[PDB]
Amino acid sequence: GALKKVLTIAGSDTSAGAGMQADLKTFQELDTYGMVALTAIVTMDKDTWSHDVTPLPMDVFEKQLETALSIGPDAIKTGMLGTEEIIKRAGEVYEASNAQYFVVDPVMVCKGEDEVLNPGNTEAMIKYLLPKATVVTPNLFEAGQLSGLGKLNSIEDMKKAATIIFDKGAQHVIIKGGKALDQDKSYDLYYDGQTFYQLTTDMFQQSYNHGAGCTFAAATTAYLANGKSPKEAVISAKAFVASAIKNGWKMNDFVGPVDHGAYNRIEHIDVEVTEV
Amino acid sequence: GALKKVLTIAGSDTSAGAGMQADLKTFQELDTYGMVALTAIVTMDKDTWSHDVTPLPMDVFEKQLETALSIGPDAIKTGMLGTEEIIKRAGEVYEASNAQYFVVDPVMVCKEVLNPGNTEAMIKYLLPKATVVTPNLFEAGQLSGLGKLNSIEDMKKAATIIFDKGAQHVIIKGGKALDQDKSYDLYYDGQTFYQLTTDMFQQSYNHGAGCTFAAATTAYLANGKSPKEAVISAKAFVASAIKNGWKMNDFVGPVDHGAYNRIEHIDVEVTEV
Ligand SMILES: Nc1ncnc2c1ncn2[C@@H]1O[C@H](COP(=O)(O)OP(=O)(O)CP(=O)(O)O)[C@@H](O)[C@H]1O
Numbered sequence: 178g179a180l181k182k183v184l185t186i187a188g189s190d191t192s193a194g195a196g197m198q199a200d201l202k203t204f205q206e207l208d209t210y211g212m213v214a215l216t217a218i219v220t221m222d223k224d225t226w227s228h229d230v231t232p233l234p235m236d237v238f239e240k241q242l243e244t245a246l247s248i249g250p251d252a253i254k255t256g257m258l259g260t261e262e263i264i265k266r267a268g269e270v271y272e273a274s275n276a277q278y279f280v281v282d283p284v285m286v287c288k289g290e291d292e293v294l295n296p297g298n299t300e301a302m303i304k305y306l307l308p309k310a311t312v313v314t315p316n317l318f319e320a321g322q323l324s325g326l327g328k329l330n331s332i333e334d335m336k337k338a339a340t341i342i343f344d345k346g347a348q349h350v351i352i353k354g355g356k357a358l359d360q361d362k363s364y365d366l367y368y369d370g371q372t373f374y375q376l377t378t379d380m381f382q383q384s385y386n387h388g389a390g391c392t393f394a395a396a397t398t399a400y401l402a403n404g405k406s407p408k409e410a411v412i413s414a415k416a417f418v419a420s421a422i423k424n425g426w427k428m429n430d431f432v433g434p435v436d437h438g439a440y441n442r443i444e445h446i447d448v449e450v451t452e453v
Numbered sequence: 454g455a456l457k458k459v460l461t462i463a464g465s466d467t468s469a470g471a472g473m474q475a476d477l478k479t480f481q482e483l484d485t486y487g488m489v490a491l492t493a494i495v496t497m498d499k500d501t502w503s504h505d506v507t508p509l510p511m512d513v514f515e516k517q518l519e520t521a522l523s524i525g526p527d528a529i530k531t532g533m534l535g536t537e538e539i540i541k542r543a544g545e546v547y548e549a550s551n552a553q554y555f556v557v558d559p560v561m562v563c564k565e566v567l568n569p570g571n572t573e574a575m576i577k578y579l580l581p582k583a584t585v586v587t588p589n590l591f592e593a594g595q596l597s598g599l600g601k602l603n604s605i606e607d608m609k610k611a612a613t614i615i616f617d618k619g620a621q622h623v624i625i626k627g628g629k630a631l632d633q634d635k636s637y638d639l640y641y642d643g644q645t646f647y648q649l650t651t652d653m654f655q656q657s658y659n660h661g662a663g664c665t666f667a668a669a670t671t672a673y674l675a676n677g678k679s680p681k682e683a684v685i686s687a688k689a690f691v692a693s694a695i696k697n698g699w700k701m702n703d704f705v706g707p708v709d710h711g712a713y714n715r716i717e718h719i720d721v722e723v724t725e726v
Pocket residue numbers: 195196315316353354355356363364365378379380381382383386387388389390391392393415418419422
C-alpha cells in the first residue's frame with residue numbers, strides 16, 4: 178500500500194494556482210507522493226501582472242530528472258514545456274522510467290483564432306509526446322492545433338479533432354470544451370479510439386478559474402496512478418476540478434484561483450456521461 | 454472566509470520530502486493556500502545520494518518576492534536560506550507585507566557550521582521579527598551561544614537566551630537528537646516553559662521532519678491558533694508523518710506529510726517545566 182510516486186515536469190507559477198504548484202497540491206489532495214522536475218519560473222509584475230518566464234538551464238533540468246528517475250515514478254505528467262528540446266526529453270524520461278502512465282497536458286500560447294507563437298512546439302508534441310501518452314488533455318484551442326483543424330465550435334468538431342489526435346498515437350483523448358464551447362453546461366469530449374463520450378457538469382462561475390487546466394491534468398494523473406482506468410480517471414478529474422472551480426476565489430484583481438482542495442473539503446460534483 | 458495565504462521562502466528538494474515541497478504539501482493538508490519563492494534547487498546523485506545545490510539568480514528570487522508581496526501573504530515561513538543577502542531580504546519582505554505571522558526555521562549546515570556569518574545574520578535580521586523561531590537542538594546551541602545542548606534544562610537556558618535576542622516565541626526541538634525514550638520539544642513564551650512530548654518513532658525515514666514541523670506551525674498560526682496551540686498541533690502533525698515515513702532508497706526516506714489526516718492522529722503531552 179505504498180504511496181504512488183507521481184512526477185510532474187512543469188514550471189513554477191509564482192501565483193501558485195497553476196503550474197507545478199497546482200500539480201503538487203492536487204497530487205497531495207489525491208493521496209499520492211508528488212514530485213516536480215522544474216523547467217522554468219514564471220513571475221508576474223506587481224503593477225501590471227505581466228508575465229516573465231525564466232527558463233532553467235538544461236544542466237539543472239537534467240540533474241532533477243536524474244534524481245526523479247532514480248526515485249522511480251509510477252506516473253508522469255507534462256505541463257507547459259517551453260522548448261522542443263524539453264518536449265523530446267520528457268518523452269525519453271517516461272520511456273526510461275518504469276512508469277505505467279503518461280499524461281500529456283499540451284499547453285500552448287494562443288495568439289489568435291488558429292495561431293501559436295511557435296508551431297514547431299506543437300509538431301514536437303505530436304512527434305514525441307502523443308504516441309507515448311496514456312491520456313492527452315487539450316483544451317478546445319489546443320485540440321484545434323493538434324488536429325490541424327483550427328477553431329473548434331461544437332461537439333461534432335471535437336469528435337473530428339479527437340479522432341485525429343487519437344490517430345497520432347494518444348491512447349486516450351479528452352478535449353475540454355468548458356467556457357470556450359457553451360455557457361449553460363460545461364462539456365468535455367472523451368475518446369478511447371472506439372466510443373465518443375460527452376462529459377457534463379453545470380457551468381460554474383467563470384471569474385476565478387485560474388489553474389483549472391493544470392489541476393485537471395494533475396488529477397487525471399493521480400487517479401491513473403491510484404488504479405482508475407483512463408475513462409474513470411478523466412471522469413473523476415472533471416468532478417475534482419468542477420468542485421475546485423465552483424469554489425474559486427478572488428486573490429487579487431488579476432488572479433482568482435480554483436480551490437484545489439474543494440473536492441475533498443467542500444463537496445463532490447457529479448459528472449453526466451453520455452455516448453455521442 | 455477565504456483561504457489564508459501562506460508563503461514559504463525556501464529551495465526545491467527534488468526528492469520532494471523536505472524543502473518547499475514539504476511546505477506546500479503541509480500547507481495544503483492544513484487547508485491554506487500555499488505559495489513559494491524559490492531560492493535554489495537541490496538535486497541528489499543517483500548512486501550516492503550526495504546533494505548538489507544550484508542557486509537561483511537573485512533577480513528571479515527578487516521577482517518571485519515581488520509577486521508574492523503583491524498577492525499579500527497572511528503568514529510567511531523561512532526555510533533554509535543560503536546567503537546573508539537572502540536572509541536580509543526575507544526579513545524585509547515580511548516587514549513590507551501585511552502578514553501577521555513570521556515563522557523562522559533557522560536552518561544551519563553542519564561542517565561547527567558552514568557560514569557562521571549566516572547565524573549572525575539570522576540573529577540580526579530574523580529573530581527580532583519572528584512570531585516563532587524553530588531551532589533544532591543543534592541550532593538552538595548555535596543561536597544561544599551555549600554550544601551543545603543535551604537536556605531539557607539546557608533547552609530552557611537556550612530558549613531564554615533566544616527569546617532575549619528578540620524572538621516572540623521559541624520552540625526548541627529535542628526529538629531524536631535529544632535521544633530520550635520519548636520525543637521532547639520545549640516551547641517558551643517569555644513566561645512559561647512547556648515540554649511537549651510524543652512517542653519516539655522509527656528514525657530511519659525522517660526526511661522532511663524539520664521542514665514539516667515549521668510549515669505546520671505556520672499554517673496553524675495562519676488559521677487562528679495561538680503560538681502555543683500551533684506548536685502543539687504541529688508536533689502531532691509531524692509525529693504522524695514521522696510514524697508513517699517510508700523507504701525511498703537505501704539512503705533516505707521521507708515523512709508522510711498526509712499521515713495526520715489520512716492515517717492517524719498522534720497524542721501530544723503538554724507539561725510545564
Ligand atoms: N467555469 C466553468 N465551469 C465548469 N467547468 C469548467 C469551467 N471552466 C472550465 N471548466 C472545466 O474545467 C476543466 C479545465 O478546462 P480548461 O482546460 O479550459 O482549464 P483552464 O484553461 O481554464 C485553467 P489554467 O491554464 O489556468 O491551468 C474542464 O473539465 C472544463 O470543462
